[PDB]
Amino acid sequence: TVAHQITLLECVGKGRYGEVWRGSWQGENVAVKIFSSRDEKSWFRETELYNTVMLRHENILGFIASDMTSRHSSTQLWLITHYHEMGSLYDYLQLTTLDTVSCLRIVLSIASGLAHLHIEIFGGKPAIAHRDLKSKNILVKKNGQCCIADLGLAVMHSQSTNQLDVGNNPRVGTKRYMAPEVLDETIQVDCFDSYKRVDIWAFGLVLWEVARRMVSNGIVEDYKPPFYDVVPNDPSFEDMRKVVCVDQQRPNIPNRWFSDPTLTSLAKLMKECWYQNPSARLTALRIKKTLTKI
Ligand SMILES: COc1ccc(Nc2nccc(-c3c[nH]nc3-c3cccnc3)n2)cc1
């Protein structure tokens, strides 16, 4: 099994989900996600998605293997993928600023990965919603494009059967990026499009995160996570509910963006991701089309 051939080298990420390690396999870097015992259903769902859906795409993290192994005489669930030395988009945006070309390339590549996920393809894949899009779940590739990672919460739908497959995972999305209908708990869980629009909301927040780091008129904003100014680290459910639903707050558009053609376009995009009413938001394909034009 691939797990027994890998040498773990250093831990590059850690959370309640478990750990991500840079490992060595066949003399190349690979990412090894070692799930915690509390998050076995995410391992199962990711393994299911990668093994039963043809998911290869330039902007979707590339799957190598999924294994059960023994470490310290007890079972570990491993998910092995391609390694991206440039790291997560979250970490990357803190280490550099962007120019116009690099900013558009990042957000367009994310829109292409997302649209590919959302679209059903025949002759071939079901439609897939992600449900935990965020800059920590997006990796930066050496060519300046990004790829979307972590399918542990994904939901699938296929037209031939009209079957919705929401999995069996008690994990919920990252609270900071949850759409209003998730926080007020009125989202219609029996309908696939409900989940696509939860992704669109989160993608709006990612767009905002990246745009702040594009230089115009020689100035740039510091990296900040969405809603940094109004919720603490690790915000609770009620924190996000108060800010997003009750007070209807949205991320602030800096004045300097409106003096730049690109950032004004991006600002209109993200605002149409943020309607309180999910039906009003743009779709991934519409966002991809618009971004390709700018
Ligand atoms: C600054 O320190 C760092 C340097 C490099 C990296 N490189 C990297 N390469 C591939 C994947 C991931 C990753 C991040 N989040 N989740 C995954 C993942 C991995 C496997 C399966 N599913 C999700 N990170 C990370 C941190």
Short mmCIF file of C-alpha atoms and ligand atoms in Angstrom, two decimals:
data_model
loop_
_atom_site.label_atom_id
_atom_site.label_comp_id
_atom_site.label_asym_id
_atom_site.label_seq_id
_atom_site.Cartn_x
_atom_site.Cartn_y
_atom_site.Cartn_z
CA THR A 1 0.00 0.00 0.00
CA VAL A 2 1.18 3.53 -0.72
CA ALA A 3 1.09 4.39 3.00
CA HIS A 4 3.79 1.85 3.85
CA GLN A 5 6.11 3.30 1.14
CA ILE A 6 6.03 6.88 2.48
CA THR A 7 8.52 8.54 4.80
CA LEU A 8 6.90 11.27 6.89
CA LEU A 9 9.23 14.29 6.95
CA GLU A 10 7.55 17.21 8.75
CA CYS A 11 4.11 18.31 9.83
CA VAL A 12 2.90 21.25 7.71
CA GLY A 13 -0.66 21.67 9.01
CA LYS A 14 -2.72 20.62 11.98
CA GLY A 15 -6.27 21.02 13.21
CA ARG A 16 -9.25 19.25 14.67
CA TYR A 17 -9.40 17.27 11.40
CA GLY A 18 -5.96 15.83 12.16
CA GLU A 19 -2.62 16.55 10.49
CA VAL A 20 -1.10 17.18 7.08
CA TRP A 21 2.47 15.98 6.62
CA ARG A 22 4.99 16.54 3.89
CA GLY A 23 6.02 12.98 3.09
CA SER A 24 8.47 11.39 0.64
CA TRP A 25 7.10 8.83 -1.85
CA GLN A 26 8.94 7.51 -4.92
CA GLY A 27 11.47 10.28 -4.25
CA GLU A 28 8.86 13.05 -4.56
CA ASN A 29 6.97 15.17 -2.05
CA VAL A 30 3.40 14.07 -1.32
CA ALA A 31 0.85 15.46 1.10
CA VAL A 32 -0.31 12.94 3.73
CA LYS A 33 -3.50 13.90 5.55
CA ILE A 34 -3.77 11.78 8.69
CA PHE A 35 -7.28 12.06 10.04
CA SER A 36 -8.14 12.26 13.71
CA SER A 37 -10.42 9.61 15.19
CA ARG A 38 -13.09 12.33 15.53
CA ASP A 39 -13.13 12.92 11.73
CA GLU A 40 -13.31 9.41 10.21
CA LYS A 41 -16.43 10.29 8.24
CA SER A 42 -14.51 12.99 6.29
CA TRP A 43 -11.82 10.44 5.33
CA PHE A 44 -14.61 8.12 4.15
CA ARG A 45 -16.34 10.81 2.11
CA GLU A 46 -13.13 12.04 0.45
CA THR A 47 -12.12 8.47 -0.38
CA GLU A 48 -15.62 7.91 -1.77
CA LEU A 49 -15.56 11.03 -3.94
CA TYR A 50 -12.09 10.45 -5.39
CA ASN A 51 -12.62 6.73 -6.08
CA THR A 52 -16.15 6.85 -7.51
CA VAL A 53 -16.00 10.14 -9.47
CA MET A 54 -13.54 11.03 -12.23
CA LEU A 55 -12.26 14.21 -10.54
CA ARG A 56 -8.96 14.92 -12.30
CA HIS A 57 -8.84 18.66 -13.05
CA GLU A 58 -6.05 21.22 -13.08
CA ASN A 59 -7.74 23.17 -10.25
CA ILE A 60 -8.78 20.27 -8.00
CA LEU A 61 -6.20 18.77 -5.64
CA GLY A 62 -4.85 15.58 -7.19
CA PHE A 63 -5.54 12.27 -5.44
CA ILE A 64 -2.86 9.62 -5.12
CA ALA A 65 -4.09 7.07 -2.58
CA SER A 66 -6.34 6.44 0.41
CA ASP A 67 -5.13 3.89 2.98
CA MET A 68 -5.60 2.35 6.40
CA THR A 69 -2.35 1.78 8.25
CA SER A 70 -0.93 1.05 11.69
CA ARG A 71 1.09 3.69 13.53
CA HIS A 72 1.86 3.26 17.23
CA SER A 73 -0.05 -0.06 17.11
CA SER A 74 -3.39 1.55 16.20
CA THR A 75 -5.27 2.32 13.01
CA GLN A 76 -4.72 5.57 11.11
CA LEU A 77 -6.75 6.74 8.12
CA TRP A 78 -4.46 8.40 5.53
CA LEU A 79 -5.34 10.35 2.39
CA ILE A 80 -2.39 10.94 0.07
CA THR A 81 -2.41 13.69 -2.54
CA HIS A 82 -0.05 15.81 -4.59
CA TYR A 83 2.07 18.23 -2.57
CA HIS A 84 2.16 21.97 -3.31
CA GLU A 85 5.23 23.61 -1.82
CA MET A 86 3.73 27.07 -2.24
CA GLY A 87 1.26 26.10 0.52
CA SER A 88 -2.32 27.14 1.17
CA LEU A 89 -3.77 30.31 -0.33
CA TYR A 90 -4.34 31.46 3.27
CA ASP A 91 -0.61 31.22 4.09
CA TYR A 92 0.46 32.42 0.64
CA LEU A 93 -1.52 35.68 0.74
CA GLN A 94 0.37 36.62 3.95
CA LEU A 95 3.83 36.15 2.41
CA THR A 96 3.41 38.20 -0.78
CA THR A 97 1.41 40.86 -2.59
CA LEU A 98 -0.15 40.32 -6.01
CA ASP A 99 -0.18 42.20 -9.28
CA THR A 100 -3.16 42.22 -11.62
CA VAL A 101 -2.10 39.17 -13.63
CA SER A 102 -1.39 37.10 -10.52
CA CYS A 103 -4.60 38.17 -8.76
CA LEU A 104 -6.84 37.30 -11.74
CA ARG A 105 -5.02 34.01 -12.34
CA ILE A 106 -5.70 32.92 -8.74
CA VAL A 107 -9.38 33.79 -8.65
CA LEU A 108 -10.09 32.47 -12.16
CA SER A 109 -8.45 29.13 -11.38
CA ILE A 110 -10.59 28.82 -8.25
CA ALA A 111 -13.72 29.67 -10.26
CA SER A 112 -12.80 26.96 -12.82
CA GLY A 113 -12.22 24.32 -10.16
CA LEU A 114 -15.51 25.24 -8.51
CA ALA A 115 -17.56 25.33 -11.72
CA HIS A 116 -16.13 21.96 -12.75
CA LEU A 117 -17.26 20.60 -9.37
CA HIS A 118 -20.73 22.12 -9.60
CA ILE A 119 -21.53 20.99 -13.19
CA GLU A 120 -22.85 17.54 -14.09
CA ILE A 121 -20.99 16.04 -17.08
CA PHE A 122 -22.32 13.17 -19.22
CA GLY A 123 -20.60 10.69 -21.51
CA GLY A 124 -18.62 12.28 -17.00
CA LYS A 125 -19.37 13.13 -13.36
CA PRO A 126 -22.26 14.04 -11.05
CA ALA A 127 -22.76 17.57 -9.81
CA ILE A 128 -20.79 18.23 -6.62
CA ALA A 129 -21.06 20.95 -3.97
CA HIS A 130 -18.04 21.43 -1.69
CA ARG A 131 -19.58 22.91 1.54
CA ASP A 132 -16.28 24.03 3.17
CA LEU A 133 -14.66 26.38 0.67
CA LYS A 134 -12.13 28.74 2.29
CA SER A 135 -8.59 29.99 1.67
CA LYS A 136 -7.16 27.30 3.95
CA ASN A 137 -8.75 24.66 1.64
CA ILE A 138 -7.16 26.09 -1.53
CA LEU A 139 -3.55 25.39 -2.53
CA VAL A 140 -1.22 27.51 -4.70
CA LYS A 141 0.58 25.81 -7.59
CA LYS A 142 3.98 26.80 -8.93
CA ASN A 143 2.37 28.14 -12.12
CA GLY A 144 0.29 30.66 -10.12
CA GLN A 145 -2.99 28.78 -10.43
CA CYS A 146 -4.75 27.27 -7.41
CA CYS A 147 -6.48 23.94 -6.74
CA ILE A 148 -9.42 23.21 -4.41
CA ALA A 149 -8.89 20.64 -1.65
CA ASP A 150 -10.87 18.79 1.06
CA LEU A 151 -13.96 16.97 -0.27
CA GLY A 152 -14.90 15.57 3.14
CA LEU A 153 -18.22 17.43 3.27
CA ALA A 154 -19.10 17.23 -0.39
CA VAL A 155 -22.63 16.58 -1.59
CA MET A 156 -23.45 14.94 -4.93
CA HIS A 157 -26.43 15.02 -7.28
CA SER A 158 -27.16 13.24 -10.55
CA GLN A 159 -29.89 14.09 -13.04
CA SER A 160 -30.62 10.61 -14.44
CA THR A 161 -31.91 9.46 -11.02
CA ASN A 162 -32.67 12.93 -9.58
CA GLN A 163 -30.84 11.57 -6.52
CA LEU A 164 -29.33 13.81 -3.85
CA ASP A 165 -26.47 12.22 -1.85
CA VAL A 166 -25.64 14.30 1.25
CA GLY A 167 -23.43 11.71 2.91
CA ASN A 168 -23.34 10.86 6.61
CA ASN A 169 -20.88 13.29 8.27
CA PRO A 170 -21.66 15.20 11.51
CA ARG A 171 -18.93 17.73 10.62
CA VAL A 172 -20.26 21.18 9.70
CA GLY A 173 -18.60 23.89 7.67
CA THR A 174 -16.17 26.42 9.02
CA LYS A 175 -18.34 28.91 10.91
CA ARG A 176 -16.55 32.04 9.60
CA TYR A 177 -17.54 31.21 6.01
CA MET A 178 -21.10 29.95 6.60
CA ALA A 179 -23.84 31.45 4.45
CA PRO A 180 -26.75 33.30 6.15
CA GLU A 181 -29.20 30.46 5.49
CA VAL A 182 -26.82 28.04 7.24
CA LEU A 183 -26.49 30.29 10.28
CA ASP A 184 -30.19 31.03 10.59
CA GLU A 185 -30.82 27.29 9.86
CA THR A 186 -33.45 27.92 7.14
CA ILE A 187 -31.40 26.36 4.34
CA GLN A 188 -33.47 23.80 2.42
CA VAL A 189 -31.37 20.67 2.93
CA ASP A 190 -33.38 18.49 0.48
CA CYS A 191 -32.36 20.60 -2.55
CA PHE A 192 -28.99 20.35 -4.29
CA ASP A 193 -28.89 24.00 -5.40
CA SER A 194 -29.02 25.04 -1.73
CA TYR A 195 -25.46 23.68 -1.39
CA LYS A 196 -24.11 25.23 -4.60
CA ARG A 197 -25.17 28.66 -3.29
CA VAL A 198 -23.48 28.02 0.06
CA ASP A 199 -20.29 27.51 -1.97
CA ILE A 200 -20.89 30.72 -3.93
CA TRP A 201 -21.18 32.73 -0.71
CA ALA A 202 -17.86 31.34 0.54
CA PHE A 203 -16.19 31.97 -2.82
CA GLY A 204 -17.24 35.61 -2.49
CA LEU A 205 -15.38 35.75 0.82
CA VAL A 206 -12.31 34.15 -0.79
CA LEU A 207 -12.48 36.68 -3.67
CA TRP A 208 -12.42 39.47 -1.08
CA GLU A 209 -9.42 37.90 0.69
CA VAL A 210 -7.38 37.75 -2.52
CA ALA A 211 -8.39 41.17 -3.88
CA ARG A 212 -7.07 42.91 -0.76
CA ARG A 213 -3.57 41.71 -1.71
CA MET A 214 -3.58 43.05 -5.27
CA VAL A 215 -1.53 46.27 -5.54
CA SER A 216 -3.10 49.34 -7.15
CA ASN A 217 -1.83 52.95 -6.98
CA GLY A 218 1.08 51.39 -5.15
CA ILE A 219 -0.96 50.44 -2.08
CA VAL A 220 -2.42 47.20 -0.77
CA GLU A 221 -4.38 46.01 2.24
CA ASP A 222 -2.94 43.68 4.87
CA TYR A 223 -4.12 40.11 4.62
CA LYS A 224 -7.19 39.66 6.80
CA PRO A 225 -9.73 36.83 7.04
CA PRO A 226 -13.40 37.61 6.30
CA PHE A 227 -15.15 39.48 9.13
CA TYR A 228 -11.83 39.95 10.98
CA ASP A 229 -12.99 43.32 12.34
CA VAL A 230 -16.19 42.09 14.01
CA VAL A 231 -15.64 38.50 15.22
CA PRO A 232 -12.83 36.98 17.31
CA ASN A 233 -10.62 34.08 16.38
CA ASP A 234 -12.56 30.81 16.31
CA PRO A 235 -15.92 32.64 16.22
CA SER A 236 -18.92 30.84 17.64
CA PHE A 237 -22.11 30.04 15.77
CA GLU A 238 -23.95 32.86 17.50
CA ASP A 239 -21.10 35.32 16.76
CA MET A 240 -21.48 34.70 13.02
CA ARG A 241 -25.28 34.66 13.25
CA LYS A 242 -25.36 38.08 14.95
CA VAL A 243 -22.95 39.63 12.43
CA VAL A 244 -24.11 37.99 9.22
CA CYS A 245 -27.87 37.47 9.68
CA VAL A 246 -29.08 39.84 12.39
CA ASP A 247 -26.91 42.88 11.55
CA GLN A 248 -26.66 41.89 7.83
CA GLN A 249 -22.95 42.79 7.74
CA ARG A 250 -20.77 42.15 4.68
CA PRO A 251 -17.02 42.61 4.17
CA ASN A 252 -16.06 46.24 3.53
CA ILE A 253 -14.94 47.28 0.05
CA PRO A 254 -11.92 49.63 0.41
CA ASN A 255 -12.30 53.00 -1.30
CA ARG A 256 -9.12 52.49 -3.35
CA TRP A 257 -10.67 49.57 -5.27
CA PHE A 258 -13.08 51.90 -7.12
CA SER A 259 -10.11 53.71 -8.70
CA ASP A 260 -8.97 50.47 -10.34
CA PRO A 261 -10.84 48.68 -13.16
CA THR A 262 -9.99 45.15 -12.03
CA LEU A 263 -10.83 45.64 -8.35
CA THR A 264 -14.09 47.40 -9.26
CA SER A 265 -15.08 44.39 -11.37
CA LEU A 266 -14.10 42.02 -8.54
CA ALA A 267 -16.05 44.13 -6.05
CA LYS A 268 -19.21 43.82 -8.13
CA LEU A 269 -18.69 40.04 -8.38
CA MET A 270 -18.29 39.52 -4.63
CA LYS A 271 -21.33 41.69 -3.86
CA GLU A 272 -23.48 39.44 -6.06
CA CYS A 273 -22.16 36.45 -4.11
CA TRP A 274 -23.46 37.98 -0.88
CA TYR A 275 -27.22 38.42 -1.26
CA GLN A 276 -28.95 37.31 1.93
CA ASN A 277 -31.29 35.45 -0.42
CA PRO A 278 -29.46 32.45 -1.96
CA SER A 279 -31.47 32.42 -5.20
CA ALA A 280 -30.11 35.87 -6.05
CA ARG A 281 -26.41 34.89 -6.01
CA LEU A 282 -24.43 34.34 -9.19
CA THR A 283 -23.42 30.83 -10.24
CA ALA A 284 -19.90 29.44 -10.49
CA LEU A 285 -20.11 29.37 -14.28
CA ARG A 286 -21.25 32.99 -14.46
CA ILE A 287 -18.37 34.00 -12.16
CA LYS A 288 -15.91 32.03 -14.30
CA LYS A 289 -17.22 33.69 -17.49
CA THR A 290 -16.98 37.21 -16.03
CA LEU A 291 -13.49 36.59 -14.63
CA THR A 292 -12.25 35.32 -18.00
CA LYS A 293 -13.25 38.68 -19.53
CA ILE A 294 -11.63 41.20 -17.09
C1 LIG B 1 3.73 26.74 5.22
O1 LIG B 1 3.62 25.35 5.51
C2 LIG B 1 3.13 24.57 4.44
C3 LIG B 1 3.91 24.33 3.30
C4 LIG B 1 3.39 23.54 2.24
C5 LIG B 1 2.09 22.95 2.28
N1 LIG B 1 1.62 22.15 1.14
C6 LIG B 1 0.42 21.37 0.93
N2 LIG B 1 0.49 20.53 -0.13
C7 LIG B 1 -0.58 19.77 -0.42
C8 LIG B 1 -1.75 19.78 0.33
C9 LIG B 1 -1.79 20.63 1.44
C10 LIG B 1 -3.07 20.77 2.26
C11 LIG B 1 -3.44 21.94 2.94
N3 LIG B 1 -4.68 21.75 3.51
N4 LIG B 1 -5.18 20.51 3.21
C12 LIG B 1 -4.23 19.85 2.41
C13 LIG B 1 -4.56 18.44 2.00
C14 LIG B 1 -3.64 17.40 1.79
C15 LIG B 1 -4.02 16.07 1.45
C16 LIG B 1 -5.39 15.79 1.32
N5 LIG B 1 -6.31 16.76 1.51
C17 LIG B 1 -5.90 18.01 1.86
N6 LIG B 1 -0.72 21.48 1.76
C18 LIG B 1 1.33 23.21 3.44
C19 LIG B 1 1.85 24.01 4.51
#
